[PDB]
Design a protein around this ligand. Structure first.
Ligand SMILES: Nc1ncnc2c1c(-c1cnc3[nH]ccc3c1)nn2C1CCCC1
Length: 287
């Protein structure tokens, strides 16, 4: 259940303008009235909510159970009449997908973003959690370039009695073949999705992005795994290859990937990502 659900959010927080649509409700900027820090508030009407309720519950449960610099920080969930307010860390730098809009990333930027995603995955997987929707749109940055995982509605939790999941969830272009087949799978599914995300960060789009998502549901289990094509460093191509093995047990762990030559050679301080954030702000303004 939601044992630490709170009430009266406006005693503590001020709701400001809408930011965008979240996975299951609108996201607003807000203010923590005790610190004057900006927060994000995801609001969903439980009146209108129906099918999404299980995933709303899962998002809250996962947020509440994580305490990592690499996972969106959680303030709490508040009941306000028929609405639920989920109050979180404000991440104002844009998603990694947003930051791709003005043009290509360089390999330092790719390696830095991937390193931080990997730290997030290493944390989640150590907590027996599987994100299951890893993609650039669910990687959010702060204004100062910190990188955090977001969007936990379809996260899975392994336990002592259920050591694998089998639910068909995720976003088709990024889904591991064993998830599509609804085989028993685990955190190695996230490692496949990470490989697709690496291609996305390097090329701007995942493999098969031209095709109808339903078609990729047969293409992915049948086809050879994607490779990174183009003039990229050998370590980046090999990083992608390591992730995108059809056999999950042959994929490295997140911890192992943090030692990969591509990451060690190319990842730098996250603060340098502010360059990318400024590029996006300029681009959105010139638009
Ligand atoms: N915390 C945030 N800060 C700033 N902007 C945010 C967010 C979120 C957001 C929304 N839901 C979430 N669930 C778990 C992490 C998480 C993050 N989503 N967004 C959205 C980015 C596109 C629409 C608004």
């Amino acid at each position: 259940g939601m044992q630490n659900l709170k009430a009266d959010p406006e005693e503590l927080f001020t709701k400001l303008e809408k930011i965008g649509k979240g996975s299951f409700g609108e996201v607003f900027k807000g203010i923590d009235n005790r610190t004057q820090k900006v927060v994000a508030i995801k609001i969903i009407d439980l009146e209108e909510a129906e099918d999404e309720i299980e995933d709303i519950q899962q998002e809250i449960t996962v947020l509440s159970q994580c305490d990592s610099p690499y996972v969106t920080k959680y303030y709490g969930s508040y009941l306000k009449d028929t609405k639920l307010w989920i109050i979180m860390e404000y991440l104002g730098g844009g998603s990694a997908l947003d930051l791709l809009e003005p043009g290509p990333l360089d390999e330092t930027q790719i390696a830095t973003i991937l390193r931080e995603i990997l730290k997030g995955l290493d944390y989640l997987h150590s907590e027996k959690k599987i994100h299951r929707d890893i993609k650039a749109a669910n990687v959010l940055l702060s204004e100062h370039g910190e990188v955090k995982l977001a969007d936990f509605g379809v996260a899975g939790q392994l336990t002592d009695t259920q050591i694998k999941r089998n639910t068909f969830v995720g976003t088709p272009f990024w889904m591991a073949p064993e998830v599509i087949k609804q085989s028993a799978y685990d955190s190695k599914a996230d490692i496949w999705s990470l490989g697709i995300t690496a291609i996305e960060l390097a090329r701007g789009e995942p493999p098969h992005s031209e095709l109808h998502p339903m078609k990729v549901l047969f293409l992915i289990p049948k086809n050879n795994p994607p490779t990174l094509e183009g003039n990229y460093s050998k370590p980046l191509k090999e990083f992608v290859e390591a992730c995108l093995n059809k056999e999950p047990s042959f994929r490295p762990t997140a911890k192992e990937l943090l030692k990969h030559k591509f990451i060690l050679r190319n990842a730098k301080k996250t603060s340098y990502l502010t360059e990318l954030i400024d590029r996006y702000k300029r681009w959105k303004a010139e638009q």
